[PDB]
């Protein structure tokens, strides 16, 4: 019996086709992804293969102005149009709190939404009961397939789920659900979830009864053969894990941003044992036409986005200096604004040991692409912010040792004076450079804002201590020569869209007035 | 023909009786003012004197939780109960914008509200037309008296009137209105307004046809004889000005906070010439009973205030360190919070030459009377803020030369180490002390945030430059040994209530997290 699993993960609001690097589509003849093109390919496969499941491993929420305006209604609408068979909750599905998940996604999706390791307490337990499920048994041809969900146990640090949801250890929660499915004579089981490739391999190894793991969160690209685009594979597709009971369990993921459609064919025997599996993610490039009906519906929904983009978000009473002459040479108030917005975006519920789990921000000055003039009655619109932050990136959370952060600050000024992009704007850090010193030894003072403290204050950076830092995905990936960040980081989780982080902060503040205040000094 | 003018000014929300220093009444047997006691005295005078006018010279708005909750409805209600005959607009009547004045005061007052020097433009001109008047002619016995209003031309820097109101020069605007009254055979004219004692003397001198000036704003106490309480008179009551045409024009004011009722008897001849005048403000002490009906109505309205005082205003995720061990010895995050709230409260409409007219704050650490613990789910209520700021003061705007501010910072640490109240918390200032230096020479660096700049940044304090600073009225009055502030200041305007400034800022922010960030350093 052959099952074809089609899968997406970390689509992150890429409803429209994007450029090759998942930013705004500018050269239509070379654009990729989008739900209209995904619809064409899914429909084609469903005409040819008898047993198909289309699954999403979470993180449809967050990524573009579509999510900013429609707040998940676009996810329910377009996932319903594609006829997804099941979806697991991702961390970003909690960005607008549990209410922003219940309404509109859980109440409007025409497919089960799953997570076996999220437990509710208090009145929320009654409000949400049955709106998401630990698993669903689906009929596929003349057989049934059980799909069990899971979501990152770290979601409380990576989104806004509130204090009435408990995120349990994935393996601990999954095992009893898989054993329950076995008692109900369900012999084909898919674990679909959102914890990252490392956890997916552990689930494949340790959760007895799981036949295949379909994952997400880490934006992992897996491929068997020569890669079709710029993404470098982390391993073969599927990635085979040997389970504790000796079975070979395929693990799949399909990068992010709707650029690829995962495709895995699994051959099962009559007892649900996996005989073999093969496949590869399909690059959704311009060789696949965008479905005209879906494309026309996307164009209709785009009107409200164009209208929103010109509305006032808030006001500034100061000139927002995002010039290269300032932001690539010294502390600039646009850099302070964006770092303050990044820290505000990352305020999460913590225990009594931290005021907040993260207090620090770094931002390459070359990533700030325009100033914003305050003389248009102080108005700031999304279009203005898009000129400052045009790359379509995210502001991510990483864990870096102090030694790595000291190397990053040395890199920030290693060739100072040429208007190069690596000069860092900061938040929660006070740095002093002495440019008369040799490159690599110019950082003379580096103080950081504490997190494990009830009163935030600055203390010297410690080389062996691991710090949480918010920074662009461009830097987390080693952009601008920050290879030490990519190579030495101890954890990396994708954050919210860059423009959205700043837009939300400006709207909350109503009137902003960022100052240059001594975060970066020269001796 | 004898006219008795009863007058109040700068009542500033003191609806209830207060202590002798106009703070919360604690020893009822020695409390003063309040509208219930004012009603008793006004009613008594109106039984005895045939020709009485009860006038208010503005600034009923702002000062206590009454204004915070009722937003001017309490002013219309209780001024109507007292049967005020006329009121001039004060600067604080614009604290909640022109909408917060129109509704509820202008639409609900049963007496004319006046100002001849405020002109509206755009659609507001039609919306507000006739809701306030340049003057009113009132019948008094068998005669008529014209009352012409005026309001501080500096109101755009001292409140939130918006950009659709123009505040003209008082004398320029008043003169044509007084000459118009003379054409209508009104020969007895009172100028009632809110610009301060200095401007009141200029109006008495230069506006031809004005028989008496009844003022406010500067909280001026005038008295003829031995003063009845702790207020020190600035001059006799009335203060006589010789007009340009040789007449003697009495000028009156009655301190502030409803502690006194101004009382002036004027003898006019048949042609409206002033023959003589005499009087004195009446101290509203415990020898005058509170009117039982007004007192019962005040007690009924107080219920909503008690309810509000326990509601959540916002949350803190950090411990708000308002301890004396911190705030009298070093930078404390409660001090940073309050100074940031003071600066946010003073954001006003400026020309293209300033991002804001004021950027600096000083606050005596001894004025911070409690910390606020963040472990009650982060909740902050008005009752918590009242424990931090219990004195019932205001956060005022002053103009100080840099030399005066350097002397204030030397005074801040002149006897450092004894937990004395004069140690300053700051905003928009970065100070460095070297305590090994002799007292009076411990300030080694003092940088201030620019105002006449599009990008706020810090520059060294200049001894000859005049800076605007927000600080408690306690310090503006030379409290805590800051005699140099009282003696050397170049301008002083009373600001908003201390608790209200902080409460509004916390509600706007929703979640606060003030840090200790290096505003005060020790070498
Ligand atoms: C995020 N990012 C970035 O910050 N930068 C910053 O620009 C700087 C280069 O700018 P430049 O010196 O002004 C000359 P340009 O490359 O703009 O021609 C870099 O140093 C770096 O700081 C560059 C690339 C970049 N991402 O590359 C992917 C990408 C490119 C274009 C678009 Cl529209 C969307 C995604
Ligand atoms: C505003 N203010 C103030 O900050 N202080 C600060 O307290 C300090 C004295 O406090 P302490 O060392 O704790 C001994 P205490 O006088 O509380 O017994 C002063 O140095 C100064 O910084 C003092 C008086 C004061 N205003 O005096 C008028 C007033 C007094 C009491 C009440 Cl409830 C209402 C209005
Ligand atoms: Ca099986
Ligand atoms: Ca006259
Ligand atoms: Zn994701
Ligand atoms: Zn994720
Ligand atoms: Zn006043
Ligand atoms: Zn005033």
Curated annotation (Swiss-Prot), chains A, B:
EC nos: 3.1.3.35, 3.1.3.5, 3.1.3.89, 3.1.3.91
Residues with glycosylation annotation: 27, 285, 307, 377
Pfam families assigned to the protein according to its UniProt record, in alphabetical order: 5_nucleotid_C, Metallophos
Reactions catalysed, as given in the entry: a ribonucleoside 5'-phosphate + H2O = a ribonucleoside + phosphate; a 2'-deoxyribonucleoside 5'-phosphate + H2O = a 2'-deoxyribonucleoside + phosphate; dTMP + H2O = thymidine + phosphate; CMP + H2O = cytidine + phosphate
Binding of Zn(2+) 1, residues: 10, 12, 59
Broad class of the protein's primary localization: membrane
Domain of life of the organism encoding this protein: Eukaryota
Effect ascribed to mutating residue 332 to Y: In CALJA; absence from the plasma-membrane; exhibits no catalytic AMPase activity
GO CC entries: cell surface; cytosol; external side of plasma membrane; extracellular exosome; membrane; nucleoplasm; plasma membrane
Example of a GO MF term: IMP 5'-nucleotidase activity
UniProt note on regulation of activity: Inhibited by adenosine 5'-(alpha,beta-methylene)-diphosphate (AMPCP).
Binding site for IMP: 328, 364, 369, 391, 474, 480
Keywords recorded for this protein, A-Z: Cell membrane, Disease variant, Disulfide bond, Glycoprotein, GPI-anchor, Hydrolase, Lipoprotein, Membrane, Metal-binding, Nucleotide-binding, Signal, Zinc
InterPro entries: 5'-Nucleotdase_C (IPR008334), 5'-Nucleotdase_C_sf (IPR036907), 5'-Nucleotdase_CS (IPR006146), 5_nucleotidase/apyrase (IPR006179), Calcineurin-like_PHP_ApaH (IPR004843), Metallo-depent_PP-like (IPR029052)
Disease implication from the record: Calcification of joints and arteries: A condition characterized by adult-onset calcification of the lower extremity arteries, including the iliac, femoral and tibial arteries, and hand and foot capsule joints. Age of onset has been reported as early as the second decade of life, usually involving intense joint pain or calcification in the hands.
Family membership: Belongs to the 5'-nucleotidase family.
Subunit structure: Homodimer.
Protein name: 5'-nucleotidase
Source organism (scientific name): Homo sapiens (Human)
